[PDB]
Design a protein around this ligand. Structure first.
Ligand SMILES: NC(=O)C1=CN([C@@H]2O[C@H](COP(=O)(O)OP(=O)(O)OC[C@H]3O[C@@H](n4cnc5c(N)ncnc54)[C@H](OP(=O)(O)O)[C@@H]3O)[C@@H](O)[C@H]2O)C=CC1
Ligand SMILES: NC(=O)C1=CN([C@@H]2O[C@H](COP(=O)(O)OP(=O)(O)OC[C@H]3O[C@@H](n4cnc5c(N)ncnc54)[C@H](OP(=O)(O)O)[C@@H]3O)[C@@H](O)[C@H]2O)C=CC1
Ligand SMILES: NC(=O)C1=CN([C@@H]2O[C@H](COP(=O)(O)OP(=O)(O)OC[C@H]3O[C@@H](n4cnc5c(N)ncnc54)[C@H](OP(=O)(O)O)[C@@H]3O)[C@@H](O)[C@H]2O)C=CC1
Ligand SMILES: NC(=O)C1=CN([C@@H]2O[C@H](COP(=O)(O)OP(=O)(O)OC[C@H]3O[C@@H](n4cnc5c(N)ncnc54)[C@H](OP(=O)(O)O)[C@@H]3O)[C@@H](O)[C@H]2O)C=CC1
Lengths: 242, 242, 242, 242
């Protein structure tokens, strides 16, 4: 697509979906701000995509995030992608797991989104925000109760953001994928027997590719989805239909 | 997008969304079979898109449809778009309105999709089918109870088809728009006061454009949505978030 | 619960869920009009429940239905329960199965509900209508694409009826059960291995009992659910959370 | 309903829905453990329902909650009702508003539910847990973005808890009310014009009564809902159908 003249911000840009989203946006002419936790991931990325603006910060830290992004400038496109999975059965969920999960998976989405939306509103420009969610915001998954809860909350966050920012020409949508074999996908489907039966339950008999997720993100960021806001696109290989 | 070498079939191709979907697919290199009720619409459409293959049939007739399409040949992409709206308050719904609405809006989707899926399966090719639904498959609308019910049924038809055809590499999805000012949209939003109030409820403060729907249909038909099947994309200008 | 002084109409009263619903309402002091297809069922039910008003009619027949129910009189509680299952994989669905399924499972609901609602409105009394749907209005189930479609339409039929009749103080809800071992549950889960695997996927590790469905129907019909209308109660033994 | 021989624990028992739930359970024969923030509300409640067991603790404090409830003993029925509303438009949401809201509205539900569920499992007895959610877990509401997010999270929490605890015969459901004129309801619908518009959008043209909410909670806790788990009951006076 063509994002020339647009500036995008992608969180969780060091690995997986976020990294490939930065690469796709960079190839489409967008000026990209790449935010992630491990600096070495930004070092290699800047070598691969010359011209990106790296920002190393722990999005789970509100103060640090404010200091790091408070002054990054005009952002036209935002991809809230950073998240972490702390797998624990319900009866074993700890206070720390809950706190870390909501801070990174959801609180950072409120924070970065408000900073970016304020800017958009100030300049008087339309905008598009994509919240990377999961199919687990709708279906259950073993050992993912805390993570699922952060995605379920994201569903309403996306809906309410769309309602409140809509009058400002800002669209907000989510992408809800099934398992994607990045570091996170390999972690959750670690059990070979589980993965097997899990894949089998998918109508398409496969897991999603990173490319499939990146494609939906770009579609929602582009003007090709000008009347799409408030809901999401399932990249679940048909899992919800199972 | 590049649809060269692929053959598509679009129902309800004579006006509105269907007519523009034919134009967009034709412009993308696809051979297009245009099926519609009024023959004169096919005459004009053929001038605009030289090369389309016109088929004039009333899709509410199972026997006529079987004869008209039993031998159209290879179809790789299918857009089930034909539908009719018969506006009547619940207490005034007649057997006739019910029968016509279900024959055209839903039974034809079953029949044509069966015909096309058998062919795809026989040729051993993947396929992508798009069912044009409505946001009213999810939200109420005055005077549209029967029409809404056909769209509500479409949600499960879409999900079930995705589950059954997925192992054959066939993807099935729906597009769910809000009001789009085609002949059908203008008819449904006839009351000015109602239209004003309706528009105001939309977060984006507008109705959808035909182009917005067509963009989503092409996205779903393309290989850029390779892990999306069983659900739909809302082209509701944020209505479900209101 | 106490339904003394109220008159209810239950369709598909000759067997299963409908039969027990009649018994429960009868035991609660309600005057019951039992409508079913096979007369012999009405004859035995009348011995067991002296006082009920039997009506033998094929609900798939609009004219016979209008003739048989056009003058039953005041009805305060309506349970639309009659339905039939014609099992067929998607590529084998026939025009006949579609037509029979939609006329019995859905058109009859439109027709009987109109007659009853018109009466409640004339007399100026509040009312409660319960549409017996299924968990398959939401999840897929092998060989039930047509039946599932009729239930999906029922989801919207219920919302729209609640929306249009709400100002007349008439509530409309649905009960959505998983498999119940009536004659219908039996045929639908005739495959032993399939049944075992289906049962195992339910969080509660069981199918629903007829009593469970009847209990939710009664709850929705009662004044104990005075602010409930437009949605349904899942009697799915947790299936949707699987 | 009869809850004799059973022990229930209700959080947020000092006012509104929680207070009436304790009253209803007390009258139905259960021993009730009333958990709330303000001690004086428990003093007045014990007068009304002699025999209840008061527990004064701030549920937003994990450590204090653990000390306070770690030794309460056998619990058969749980009502996770405590919650707080901090009204703020999206662009004005603060770190503290987010943290407090998720600590009280959701983290406590994880914690208390874990303790109670471990007990039920340890004793080898079945259990029923009701999470008081809201219709805003599904629909947007002005100035309630943070609160809606906590309820959206509760939907997946409820669903995932039902999945994980189902094999232990523990049912988990939610009740999702529209505005109820308790102190919280008054706070939220303070603007008269807004409250007027809101009420008129409800198909039933009214807000829910506390009794309506309590009725559904008791139904879910009772064995009259033996195959209901994972979802919820809308006590929205038809709002979701508007
Ligand atoms: N893979 C899958 O199976 C699925 C993933 N998703 C979603 O996609 C998104 C991306 O996941 P995926 O690409 O798979 O994951 P990866 O683990 O591959 O990447 C996550 C990235 O986000 C970064 N990140 C995490 N926490 C922070 C933090 N506290 N501060 C700053 N950056 C952070 C990580 O940094 P670092 O490694 O340095 O900590 C990493 O660069 C997430 O929202 C996830 O929920 C949705 C469905 C499926
Ligand atoms: N416009 C809107 O507000 C919305 C529309 N939609 C959906 O989009 C789709 C297209 O709608 P739209 O373009 O607005 O409608 P139009 O009325 O503008 O066009 C519909 C087309 O379908 C054809 N068609 C209708 N019945 C038959 C039939 N029995 N046999 C063969 N062809 C038939 C019509 O032919 P003819 O005129 O000759 O009868 C016409 O060419 C429909 O599925 C509609 O439900 C969804 C949401 C909103
Ligand atoms: N059992 C299950 O697994 C589930 C059932 N349901 C729903 O529950 C409801 C009842 O099902 P259930 O009790 O199991 O089914 P049964 O087949 O056991 O009973 C259905 C009853 O309705 C009657 N009926 C069917 N067609 C007509 C008709 N054309 N005219 C008049 N009466 C008719 C049947 O009469 P007759 O025998 O004479 O034809 C029978 O009396 C249905 O809506 C079904 O969709 C939902 C989920 C699960
Ligand atoms: N009212 C409405 O319009 C609706 C309410 N609900 C839900 O119903 C439930 C009850 O609401 P409602 O009765 O109206 O509210 P009220 O404000 O009337 O009552 C809430 C009760 O919970 C207590 N509480 C709050 N925070 C804590 C805490 N940190 N620790 C211990 N107790 C606490 C309050 O104590 P204290 O006063 O001393 O702080 C109070 O006793 C909530 O979950 C709410 O989300 C859902 C939909 C609509």
């Amino acid at each position: 697509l063509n994002f020339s003249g647009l500036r995008a911000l992608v969180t969780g840009a060091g690995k997986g979906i976020g990294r490939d989203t930065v690469k796709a946006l960079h190839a489409s002419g967008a000026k990209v701000v790449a935010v992630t936790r491990t600096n070495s991931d930004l070092v290699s990325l800047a070598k691969e995509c010359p011209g990106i603006e790296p920002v190393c910060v722990d999005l789970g830290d509100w103060d640090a995030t404010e200091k790091a992004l408070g002054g990054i400038g005009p952002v036209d496109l935002l991809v809230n992608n950073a998240a972490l999975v702390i797998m624990q059965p319900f009866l074993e969920v700890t206070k720390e797991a809950f706190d870390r999960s909501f801070s990174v998976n959801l609180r950072s989405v409120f924070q970065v989104s408000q900073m970016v939306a304020r800017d958009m509103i100030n300049r008087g420009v339309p905008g598009s925000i994509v919240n990377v969610s999961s199919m687990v915001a709708h279906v259950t998954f073993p050992n993912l109760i805390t993570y699922s809860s952060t995605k379920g909350a994201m569903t309403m966050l996306t809906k309410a953001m769309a309602m409140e920012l809509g009058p400002h020409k800002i669209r907000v949508n989510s992408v809800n994928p099934t398992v994607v074999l990045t570091d996170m996908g390999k972690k959750v489907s670690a059990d070979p027997e589980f993965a097997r039966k899990l894949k089998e339950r998918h109508p398409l008999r496969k897991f999603a590719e990173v490319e499939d997720v990146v494609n939906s993100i770009l579609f929602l960021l582009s003007d090709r989805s000008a009347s799409t806001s408030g809901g999401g696109i399932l990249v679940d290989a048909g899992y919800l239909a199972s």
